[PDB]
């Protein structure tokens, strides 16, 4: 059996993401709309910035900008906490430090509006030195890719998780993005306290040709792994 909530995943879902964010002060908004298949962990987005031009690179909010399209392999199907939370949601937090600048802290609420899933967040960055990495748009527009380690916090009813993202630097090296996570349930009913086990995840970035706004493409694939 799979949880209720993973029912509402077996096609195609429409994904609505709206961000509001500040660092150092430059405040903005994203936008974002696509699909999810998780079936095939697979999402195709594109992302707005809404205010005008975005003061960070686009790199380092695509973490922040939906891990309940993970494709779950069946013999881990009971180690699916995003999905078991579902229709009612997850609060989703982040810290993520960035090696040798600023931080970002990150609150999300990811539930069901209908059939659409939704992900809403309010993200807060300090600390970032003004030519740094970030501030200074450093960073090239690459594709991210590495694992979430999940972990139960059974206390919270929730799951933690931490992961690198290692940015590549527009003189070859890299700027490290240190993420921790928390997950907590919105609805009171029972959900899927996994076993430690990992989202391997790769999202690929692109512009669209006819986009005069500032915007992000992406096409990601995330899968769970780590169990057997
Ligand atoms: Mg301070």
């Given at each position: ?31 974002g709309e696509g699909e999810g298949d998780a079936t095939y962990g697979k999402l195709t987005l ?48 982040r810290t993520i430090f960035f090696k040798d600048d600023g931080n970002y802290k990150t609150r ?75 997950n907590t349930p919105i609805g009171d009913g029972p959900v899927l306290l996994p076993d430690n ?32």
């Amino acid at each position: 059996m799979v949880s209720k909530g993973e029912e509402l995943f077996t096609g195609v879902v429409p994904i609505l993401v709206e961000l509001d964010g500040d660092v150092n002060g430059h405040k903005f908004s994203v936008s974002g709309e696509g699909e999810g298949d998780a079936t095939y962990g697979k999402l195709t987005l594109k992302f707005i910035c809404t205010t005008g031009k975005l003061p960070v690179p686009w790199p380092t909010l695509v973490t922040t900008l939906v891990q309940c399209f993970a494709r779950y392999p069946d013999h881990m199907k009971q180690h699916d906490f995003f999905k078991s939370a579902m229709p009612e949601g997850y609060v989703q937090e982040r810290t993520i430090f960035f090696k040798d600048d600023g931080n970002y802290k990150t609150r999300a609420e990811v539930k069901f509006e209908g059939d659409t899933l939704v992900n809403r967040i309010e993200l807060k960055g300090i600390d970032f030195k003004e030519d740094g990495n970030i501030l200074g748009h450093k960073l090239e527009y690459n594709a991210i890719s590495d694992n979430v380690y999940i972990t139960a916090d059974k206390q919270k009813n929730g799951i933690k998780a931490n992961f690198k993202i290692r940015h590549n630097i527009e003189d070859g090296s890299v700027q490290l993005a240190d993420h921790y996570q928390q997950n907590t349930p919105i609805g009171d009913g029972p959900v899927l306290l996994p076993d430690n086990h990992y989202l391997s995840t790769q999202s690929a970035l692109s512009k669209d040709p006819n986009e005069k706004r500032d915007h992000m493409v992406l096409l990601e694939f995330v899968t769970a792994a780590g169990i057997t």
